[PDB]
Structure 1
Amino acid sequence: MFSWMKKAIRTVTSSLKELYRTKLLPLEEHYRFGSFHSPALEDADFDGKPMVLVAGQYSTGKTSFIQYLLEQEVPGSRVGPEPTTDCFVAVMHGETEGTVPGNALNPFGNTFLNRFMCAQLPNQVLESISIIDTPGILSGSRGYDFPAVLRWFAERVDLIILLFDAHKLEISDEFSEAIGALRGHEDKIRVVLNKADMVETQQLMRVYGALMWALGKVVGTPEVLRVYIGSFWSQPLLVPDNRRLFELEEQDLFRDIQGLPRHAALRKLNDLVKRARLVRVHAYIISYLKKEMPTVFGKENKKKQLILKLPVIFAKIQLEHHISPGDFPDCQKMQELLMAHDFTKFHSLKPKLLEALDDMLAQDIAKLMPLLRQEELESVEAGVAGGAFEGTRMGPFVDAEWVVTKDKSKYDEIFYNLAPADGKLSGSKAKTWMVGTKLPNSVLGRIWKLSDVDRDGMLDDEEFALASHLIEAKLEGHGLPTNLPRRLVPPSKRRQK
């Protein structure tokens, strides 16, 4: 099985590749990292185009989202209310429109990727990045391990978009399992609250709350994840109240996903750094077992013991080598994988190699930062090209004193003549006068809303003066502001700022 997915001149990118093969690869290969965690990296991992993964439950809008980013339909995947997508669609660039199934790029070492399709089409966006539509996560058995495959993408992908639909939020257990697989790559996650224009403004808040309340417990990290609220959707808004917010959030995401090529080399560095640590941990985990094993006699029991003692084995290694619990892999898995290996064949601890790795992380990596910083402004305004990211899409358009004080004393005469109690005119009394202006009820309401600044249901002299001013304004032929400007707020009422 193999991936074509990732689609002089001494660059930080190359430097990384050279560092890997020189100071990591030996350490991986000596302690057989590839037979436990992840196989040896290839040039494709360094020279390939950046990728963005899109995941979520059924009917969350993943396929729609990609289509929306593209402003164009996906050859393979189609939109539908019932579970439609049933495979991993690797939406990537193509000279001509069309698709190609799995197995097109001796696999006697057999494949189950036959359920994996590649969609190819000519598109400005696809010149910069390659998007991956995944199958819907089950909500409430399968032919393969779904978390592990996400964990596989997590190591290689640039952005992980997780969708949730405001309409029918469900944070289900197979999902809760999925997140566990992303552990260690929190920073790549971008939670998206889709269909936010479908639920009522109050309801949206509940949903949003619940989601964060949930996600808080699931990922468990103290660093809150950024959510993006919207409807990634070329169609009209069901409820428009929160239009500004959605189109603001959209942009925040689009800017973040646009700069991926510019910020490509850094994530590679960081992910290499992250790998190094797991490699290092693994090394000690193997080495320590081989040390504990006997030469020839009584080994079968010692293996059976050691695997049961593994929790203690980790704990003891954490202490004496000063390494964060977050670096260690899931014990329960190691437990299982270690059963398949011949403990006697394990290699010894070889400080020689470990030192190289350590020195890579200590100095070599520190040295590159200067260069990287230079590369991140030397020439990096490539960005994600046209599509939905295009600017034209937004459209081709885009200290004082109170102004009624001059007419104040005129209004007061009318005010106090209407018998307000305690300097306050009742709503009942205010309406019965206001309507006397012969203005449409609707307008009079909008005036009232504006004028009752302290919102107590009554009008004092200043508020009445304001109301009157507005009534005159509209009577002369003017539009009422949807919201009062600081300027029109009666001086005494204005905020302290």
Structure 2
Amino acid sequence: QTVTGGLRSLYQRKVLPLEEAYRFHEFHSPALEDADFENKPMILLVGQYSTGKTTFIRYLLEQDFPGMRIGPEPTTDSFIAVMYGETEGSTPGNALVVDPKKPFRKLSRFGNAFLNRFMCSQLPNQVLKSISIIDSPGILSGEKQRISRGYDFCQVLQWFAERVDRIILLFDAHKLDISDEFSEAIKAFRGQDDKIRVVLNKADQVDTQQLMRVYGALMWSLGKVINTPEVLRVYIGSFWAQPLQNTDNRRLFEAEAQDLFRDIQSLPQKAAVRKLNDLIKRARLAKVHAYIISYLKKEMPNMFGKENKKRELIYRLPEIYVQLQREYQISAGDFPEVKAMQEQLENYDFTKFHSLKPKLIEAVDNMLTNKISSLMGLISQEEMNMPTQMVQGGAFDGTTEGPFNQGYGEGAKEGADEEEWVVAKDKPVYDELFYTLSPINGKISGVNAKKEMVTSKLPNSVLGKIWKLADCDCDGMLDEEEFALAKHLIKIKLDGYELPNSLPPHLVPPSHRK
């Protein structure tokens, strides 16, 4: 009996009844699933074509994907639900929208084209025991009608936004675009403005004025598109595993990247709570709809004058809302939009409506007063079940050092350049000394590498930098190519040169490149 189990149980037992009785599923959102409870915290990543969302997710992962490939070209022709799988592989969308332990059984409504353009990528990763990431198809910039798609992208994105932990909106400076498809998409995101984080990628490859006013043009457009004057927090930088192109704004890029990274790191202890958040949200909206329907039903006459009475009631709907607020003490922010309720109301026959049943309303109030109250202690006890999503480093970060310290000035630390093989900075003679070091299974162990490259008499900080740069697979042990790269850096330092913070793919071994 977990708190998630309690939430789903209370829902299925006594929120679904009024939902089905008053067709809340036919007005705002259909009946929920066990998935929205059993699912892990989730990050949904949207953006137009060629933005680099695949690059973003792989940079977060430090690992490639079973299904999806990085490309500056539009390759994301389908949604990618990358999640924790026991074995490397993938599973399609019609089998994803049914899977008991996946958040997506309620996507079966859209069906057909969405489920064929909907994929899942299962892999074991320490990020993935924590989260699942939904890479959306690149939002089209070809000025396309909604009917041309085989599915309603606005509706699917709204369905996600009702449930996502964090929605990231990725815009690139090189191919800066603001499309009508994205515009109607963000109107689909209306109602959940908290979850959107706007991120400006590829800010390093352009000049200072170019970056300045591409940010400009984008966010003049955004100010009108969102229509909400509240400022949306931006993250300007290059989430990119390669060295910076222009270093004018490196400080700003790294600051924004770190801020976004920590904001993402805050979600694990946020995971069950926002389940409860959405539970309250839908409970209040459901009871407001219940009072609306009950008032309409009681105003419905028996058999005669029904057409005129309905015609009067549809126009009288606003003051009905005012009376409901006054006589039920319910906030004005819980009501749905009056005009939308209008067009949804004429489609219904008023005779079929159900009368007020106080049992449901009373027990929902009892929920909000006491069952969440009981579940609070369970939440506090379960606050540490999974605290460790994080935005991890990569193959080239200051944790890959392993048994090395980061930066310091010991006398047990040594001089800039004292020892390394000189002409052996070529691959075969790297391998000669690599195997005179007696490696195991073609791999020099961590301690053996320590004892060998401490004889280089280089400072321990820079030695750890060499290790973190070379050790691409991040197993804490050096292969042939990683050893060659490390001793390449050592020779370059002998000649006199500063170690790069992150190595380029050029210096990455060819087999270790993506």
Query: TM-score normalized by structure 2?
Result: 0.67
State the match for 1:226 in structure 2.
233
Number of residues of Structure 1 aligned to a counterpart in Structure 2: 388
Do the aligned residues in 1 keep the contact of 2:157 with 2:189 (CA within 8 Å)?
yes
State the match for 2:47 in structure 1.
56
State the match for 2:111 in structure 1.
111
Instruction: Classify the secondary structure of the residue corresponding to 1:128.
Output: coil
State the match for 1:128 in structure 2.
130
The answer to whether the aligner puts 1:284 opposite 2:259 as a matched pair is no
| Distance across 2 between alignment mates of 1:56 and 1:89 | 13
Provide, for residues 7-32 of structure 1, a one-character-per-residue CA deviation record: whole Å limited to 9, x for no partner. xx4x4333323432344223222212
Provide, for residues 229-273 of structure 1, a one-character-per-residue CA deviation record: whole Å limited to 9, x for no partner. 111222232211112222232222222223423321111111111
State the match for 1:246 in structure 2.
253
Percent identity between matched residues is 69
State how 1:41-52 maps to structure 2 within 5 Å.
41-52=32-43
| Distance across 1 between alignment mates of 2:230 and 2:280 | 20
Q: Decide whether aligned partners of structure 1 residues 304 and 117 sit closer, same or farther in structure 2, where only a CA change above 3 A counts.
A: farther
Do the aligned residues in 1 keep the contact of 2:269 with 2:387 (CA within 8 Å)?
yes
Q: Per-residue deviation at 1:367?
A: 5.5
State the match for 2:350 in structure 1.
343
Letter of the 2:365 counterpart: D
Q: Decide whether aligned partners of structure 1 residues 111 and 383 sit closer, same or farther in structure 2, where only a CA change above 3 A counts.
A: closer
Provide, for residues 410-463 of structure 1, a one-character-per-residue CA deviation record: whole Å limited to 9, x for no partner. xxxxxxxxxxxxxxxxxxxxxxxxxxxxxxxxxxxxxxxxxxxxxxxxxxxxxx
Q: Per-residue deviation at 1:362?
A: 4.0
Q: Decide whether aligned partners of structure 1 residues 123 and 385 sit closer, same or farther in structure 2, where only a CA change above 3 A counts.
A: farther
Instruction: Classify the secondary structure of the residue corresponding to 2:116.
Output: coil
Q: Per-residue deviation at 1:354?
A: 1.7
| Distance across 1 between alignment mates of 2:25 and 2:259 | 38
The answer to whether the aligner puts 1:397 opposite 2:397 as a matched pair is no
Do the aligned residues in 1 keep the contact of 2:165 with 2:195 (CA within 8 Å)?
yes
State the match for 2:19 in structure 1.
28
Provide, for residues 36-92 of structure 1, a one-character-per-residue CA deviation record: whole Å limited to 9, x for no partner. 222322332222222110012222222221122122333333334443322212122
Do the aligned residues in 2 keep the contact of 1:102 with 1:116 (CA within 8 Å)?
yes
State the match for 1:360 in structure 2.
367
State how 1:169-318 maps to structure 2 within 5 Å.
169-221=176-228, 223-310=230-317, 313-314=320-321, 317-318=324-325
Q: Per-residue deviation at 1:109?
A: 8.4
State the match for 1:383 in structure 2.
389
Q: Per-residue deviation at 1:159?
A: 0.9
The answer to whether the aligner puts 1:146 opposite 2:148 as a matched pair is no
| Distance across 2 between alignment mates of 1:183 and 1:224 | 15
Q: Per-residue deviation at 1:138?
A: 2.9
Q: Which has the higher helix share?
A: 1
| Distance across 2 between alignment mates of 1:343 and 1:177 | 32
Instruction: Classify the secondary structure of the residue corresponding to 1:392.
Output: coil
Q: Per-residue deviation at 1:161?
A: 0.8
Q: Decide whether aligned partners of structure 1 residues 359 and 162 sit closer, same or farther in structure 2, where only a CA change above 3 A counts.
A: same
Letter of the 1:346 counterpart: F
Q: Per-residue deviation at 1:201?
A: 2.3
Q: Decide whether aligned partners of structure 1 residues 131 and 283 sit closer, same or farther in structure 2, where only a CA change above 3 A counts.
A: same
Provide, for residues 349-406 of structure 1, a one-character-per-residue CA deviation record: whole Å limited to 9, x for no partner. 2333223223333454356445534543x555443586649963587634xxxxxxxx
Q: Decide whether aligned partners of structure 1 residues 388 and 304 sit closer, same or farther in structure 2, where only a CA change above 3 A counts.
A: farther
| Distance across 1 between alignment mates of 2:275 and 2:395 | 24
The answer to whether the aligner puts 1:77 opposite 2:83 as a matched pair is no
Instruction: Classify the secondary structure of the residue corresponding to 2:128.
Output: helix
Aligned counterpart in structure 1 of residue 8 of structure 2, from 12, 17, 21: 17
Q: Per-residue deviation at 1:317?
A: 4.1
| Distance across 2 between alignment mates of 1:315 and 1:68 | 51
Instruction: Classify the secondary structure of the residue corresponding to 1:262.
Output: helix
Q: Per-residue deviation at 1:347?
A: 1.0
Choose 360-369 or 385-394, whichever is displaced more: 385-394
State how 1:147-162 maps to structure 2 within 5 Å.
147-162=154-169
| Distance across 2 between alignment mates of 1:247 and 1:64 | 17
| Distance across 1 between alignment mates of 2:300 and 2:181 | 38
| Distance across 2 between alignment mates of 1:322 and 1:212 | 40
Instruction: Classify the secondary structure of the residue corresponding to 1:127.
Output: coil
Q: Per-residue deviation at 1:313?
A: 4.6
Instruction: Classify the secondary structure of the residue corresponding to 2:355.
Output: coil
Provide, for residues 175-208 of structure 1, a one-character-per-residue CA deviation record: whole Å limited to 9, x for no partner. 2222222222222222111111122223333333
Q: Decide whether aligned partners of structure 1 residues 214 and 130 sit closer, same or farther in structure 2, where only a CA change above 3 A counts.
A: same
Letter of the 1:67 counterpart: R
Q: Per-residue deviation at 1:153?
A: 0.5
Q: Decide whether aligned partners of structure 1 residues 385 and 186 sit closer, same or farther in structure 2, where only a CA change above 3 A counts.
A: closer
Q: Per-residue deviation at 1:152?
A: 0.4
Letter of the 2:210 counterpart: Q
Q: Decide whether aligned partners of structure 1 residues 282 and 147 sit closer, same or farther in structure 2, where only a CA change above 3 A counts.
A: same
State the match for 1:412 in structure 2.
none
Do the aligned residues in 2 keep the contact of 1:262 with 1:383 (CA within 8 Å)?
no
Do the aligned residues in 1 keep the contact of 2:110 with 2:152 (CA within 8 Å)?
no
Choose 88-97 or 212-221, whichever is displaced more: 212-221
| Distance across 1 between alignment mates of 2:239 and 2:120 | 23
Provide, for residues 312-331 of structure 1, a one-character-per-residue CA deviation record: whole Å limited to 9, x for no partner. 55455455545445433344
| Distance across 2 between alignment mates of 1:379 and 1:114 | 35
State the match for 1:441 in structure 2.
none
State the match for 2:450 in structure 1.
none
Instruction: Classify the secondary structure of the residue corresponding to 1:156.
Output: coil
Aligned counterpart in structure 2 of residue 137 of structure 1, from 136, 139, 147: 139
Query: TM-score normalized by structure 1?
Result: 0.69
The answer to whether the aligner puts 1:329 opposite 2:336 as a matched pair is yes
Letter of the 2:79 counterpart: F
Q: Per-residue deviation at 1:279?
A: 0.8
Choose 77-86 or 196-205, whichever is displaced more: 77-86
